[PDB]
Write a protein that binds this ligand. Structure first.
Ligand SMILES: c1cnc(N2CC[C@]3(CCOC3)C2)cn1
Ligand SMILES: c1cnc(N2CC[C@]3(CCOC3)C2)cn1
Lengths: 304, 304
């Protein structure tokens, strides 16, 4: 019993982190096979970041200008290319610790683990969600760029995020490993405001199932609702609309607990309208939305 | 910027997890050098756990009755001994992935990372604190026993916890790696009620410093207090008494922020008396107490 914000074990990703330096800029790279992936802004001065022309800045860079260090050993860069907002540095040595991997582009509301790194060295691991406004609420200091987000399916690491930027509001933006930003963000130090950070309703409902499984039951009420009625309340409270697809995804938790999804929606509706009244659910005083239905099943079943 | 509940990178500990089976009981072991450490209750049936005589049950066990599997390779057990509530299984092979390590017994209020494991396989990593009543609020299913808690100082893993038990109230109890339980708990399926789960005041104050560093400032008020005045309020709210030693430990965060420790205590006093009024601090609607002053400095400074 018990329910924790849990990250994937990080060792398979630790084995891929390297340091990338270009001139005076140092950040992190991801070494998979004989390619190191890193933010293309490694080539920028902080001056450059105000209005960078990446193709033009990259013309002035040679393979030997990209210093890649794996632990305290230098890797030889034999090619480089820009793909969207990432650089791919071809090295002469395959990472011997390369895990089974995929590159995936996740949808808003999907969770992942971040291995926060500085100078190619892991500092910590935490669980994130892709917010509905395509930001993440991370913990990233200067030097953390190139830190990655991932999920694991048994022995296969699906890399879904690489850290690039902090918005002036202190939320985070980055790319998939093909270098495409999540959301409308760009790798430029300019006015970039995030949209509404709506609550991921299907994830809240998953977590309320997790709470029931773990004996936190006080919020279960005598009511049901419909998707349309629930969605009127969701809209009012800046929750994501619940779709039939979300109801289908919660089916296994409904089955396990015997609480119909729409009954749990009616419990959530009352929580939104009534608040917590100073009570807690799974040690939280707010409704937690960074567990997906799959996360709840995984943690409640002991998947390795 | 941003502040996350962050675990240590788990790879060094992943490299030490093994499966231990004795008869029909399977749980996790920690393989360091040529010793595997595991809960002594691996020798119990669930029947045995009601009133086990561990010395008597262990007489019926031989080295060959302890099946130790590291990945999908069997380790040869060449000796066993009981130390307090742990077994030490001597194997014929030093773990080649043994990190630099220490065994430490932590104090209540100290935080650590848990690598939750089943059948010797890592499932996830999360951050815990030793509660003032010597329980932890973990996420542990049947099979997670022998999962460990640790801190890392650069390349040295300090193991501080091994999981043994879930109390009937669904909180967790375990031992240090010398097999001594934290608190008054025993490895028997009996009436074991936890004492008051008081809030770790020095950790709350650390987190309020973290909040200020990260721009969450609304709760800063115009007041100061004294330790004795603060402690009258702490006692009323089931907070740990603040000592001069705690004030000294918060000195670096006071310095960094320019907020005197007793001024932050007066801000905390007002939060306790007034509540949050529906506001949040670092995305929390309650006062978080599972960051130590050292954790706040570490995460705010990017230590690897
Ligand atoms: C030395 C150290 N680690 C090596 N690995 C091979 C691939 C992994 C990651 C996925 O499984 C194991 C790591 C190889 N040689
Ligand atoms: C193969 C794979 N891993 C090995 N390791 C030696 C000790 C560590 C843990 C601490 O640093 C590295 C792991 C050795 N051989």
């Amino acid at each position: 019993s018990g329910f924790r914000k849990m990250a994937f074990p990080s060792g398979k990703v630790e084995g891929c982190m390297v340091q990338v330096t270009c001139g005076t800029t140092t950040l992190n790279g991801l070494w998979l096979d004989d390619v190191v992936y890193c933010p293309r802004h490694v080539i920028c001065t902080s001056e450059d970041m105000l209005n960078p022309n990446y193709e033009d800045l990259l013309i002035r860079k040679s393979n030997h200008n990209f210093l890649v260090q794996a632990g305290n050993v230098q890797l030889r860069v034999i090619g480089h290319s820009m793909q969207n907002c990432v650089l791919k540095l071809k090295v002469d040595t395959a990472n011997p610790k390369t895990p089974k991997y995929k590159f995936v582009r996740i949808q808003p509301g999907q969770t992942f683990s971040v291995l926060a790194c500085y100078n190619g060295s892991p500092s910590g691991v935490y669980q994130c969600a892709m917010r509905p406004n395509f930001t993440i609420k991370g913990s990233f200091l200067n030097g953390s760029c190139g830190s990655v987000g991932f999920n694991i399916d048994y022995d296969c690491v699906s890399f879904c995020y690489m850290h690039h930027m902090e918005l002036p509001t202190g939320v985070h933006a980055g790319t998939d490993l093909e270098g495409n930003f999540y959301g409308p963000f760009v790798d430029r130090q300019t006015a970039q405001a995030a949209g509404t950070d709506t609550t991921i309703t299907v994830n809240v409902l998953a977590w309320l199932y997790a709470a029931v499984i773990n004996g936190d039951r006080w919020f279960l009420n005598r009511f049901t609702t419909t998707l349309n009625d629930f969605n009127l309340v969701a809209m009012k409270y800046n929750y994501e609309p619940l779709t039939q697809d979300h109801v289908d995804i919660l089916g296994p938790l409904s089955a396990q607990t015997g609480i119909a999804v729409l009954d749990m929606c009616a419990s959530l509706k009352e929580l939104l309208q009534n608040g917590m009244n100073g009570r807690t659910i799974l040690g939280s005083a707010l409704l937690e939305d960074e567990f997906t239905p799959f996360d709840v099943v995984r943690q409640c079943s002991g998947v390795t």
